[PDB]
Design a protein around this ligand. Sequence first.
Ligand SMILES: [Cl-]
Ligand SMILES: [Cu+2]
Ligand SMILES: [Fe+3]
Ligand SMILES: [Fe+3]
Lengths: 292, 287
Amino acid sequence: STPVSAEQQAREQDLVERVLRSFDATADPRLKQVMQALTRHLHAFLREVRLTEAEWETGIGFLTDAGHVTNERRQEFILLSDVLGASMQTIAMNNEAHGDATEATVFGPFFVEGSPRIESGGDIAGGAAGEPCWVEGTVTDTDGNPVPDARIEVWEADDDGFYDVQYDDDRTAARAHLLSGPDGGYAFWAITPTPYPIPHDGPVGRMLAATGRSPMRASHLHFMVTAPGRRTLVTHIFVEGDELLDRDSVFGVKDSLVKSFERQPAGAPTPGGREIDGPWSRVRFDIVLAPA
Amino acid sequence: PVSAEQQAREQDLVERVLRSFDATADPRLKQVMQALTRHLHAFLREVRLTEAEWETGIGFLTDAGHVTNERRQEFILLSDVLGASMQTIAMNNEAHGDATEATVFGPFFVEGSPRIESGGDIAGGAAGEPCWVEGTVTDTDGNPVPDARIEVWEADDDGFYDVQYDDDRTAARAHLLSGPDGGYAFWAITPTPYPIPHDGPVGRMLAATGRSPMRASHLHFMVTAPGRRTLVTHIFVEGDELLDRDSVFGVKDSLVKSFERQPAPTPGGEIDGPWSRVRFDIVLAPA
Ligand SMILES: [Cl-]
Ligand SMILES: [Cu+2]
Ligand SMILES: [Fe+3]
Ligand SMILES: [Fe+3]
């Protein structure tokens, strides 16, 4: 729609102006800039869609429900940021990869401080069910130097799609950290990653259901890599051929992070001579760290 | 400062999120989600939000979420201090001739207020200067609206609404019916400024932005009548220093009224000391 009269347009515009000038005294000029931009976009959204009072109530309830479900592990506001692409966008603006630097992507909620320490050629599965997957590669800097003693945190879901922290028996599984060797090398046994849904029993899940979207993530293994003077890398690698690669629920996929997970025959000869019942896979991931 | 390549990367991400909603069954939900996506990313890309700022914003929402309702509603208060509540009111109470402008209720409206007769007193034990309020309720063609139900509520001299006390008292709160000529009047209290709840993240945001939680002095009204568009509104005090810094943007120029201190015979004959009087003519649009 119904055409907004000039009088009515003028009233709405006057209000946006009142809100913007409310921030004029803000002491930190970046905070001021952020709050004024937030104002303009929030009011532009409201005035574009002509939000109704019932719709406003719905949004308020949504936020409130997200507040009530958010706790020590579960972070519904971060999941909302994830499914709206705001997390990936914020990573993209702050982590432009120059030269050969590995691309960054979403962190998620399932990183735990204090992961067990393994050696190269060790095994992060720690009880977790899944097909054995051998992961290897090299850490270098953007000048091509191997980087020994870079800290490599790795974590992933098991075959039922759960991170160890999601269980209630304080188990540790499918996570560890290791340190790159003298030639920058790292390797470990893990499990072949498979798709799982993000937490979807809260408001974010309701919004996904109402919009006909899926909570499912494309298969991945997480990596967080740190080294002195290097920009910390938060990333994961995806599985080439995975049908979810174009519909990841948190838009975390980048082509350069998709890796060939190569299935090996049952009985095929294994790194370190490990004995395996049936198939196993292997994947290579070379990591390049940029300057801080 | 943003490369061609980086700009394309950012816009393509926005495009992918917009396309993720293409199967939503309800066309209005789909429209709202796509608009919300566009404006959110436009914000992010305009300020180049840092990961630190993103964390601060999430922590802020989280802290608000843990304030938790039963009079205390921090997301509503956040909507209020960002002007989103008053914008929603405006768009849903559009201009219609000289129909009185609407506002939010705020958190202190109470069902079951006491009935007074026109000329009665709403104070009911509340401290403050007596204030005579009078006027007429008409429609947008100027016809008096008889038997319109007028609710009024306000804070006392200490800036508290009756329900904020621990004793179940009723004060500075009532309703009455307009007369055959649309006329209404009652004794109330000359309103003074008080703060919105400021011990939560809303308060923290206001402090960090140099903003005061103080409300400009006001009386609240709700007016209903068969066939008329219900009005929820405030009136404010001409010359109040706070008029251009109301913390929840309740103030409209049109709702500012002249509260004239007297010195001086009382309407309807009571006690004395100083007293103020105000005229408020109310105009209701069609439902
Ligand atoms: Cl815009
Ligand atoms: Cu916008
Ligand atoms: Fe994950
Ligand atoms: Fe009030």
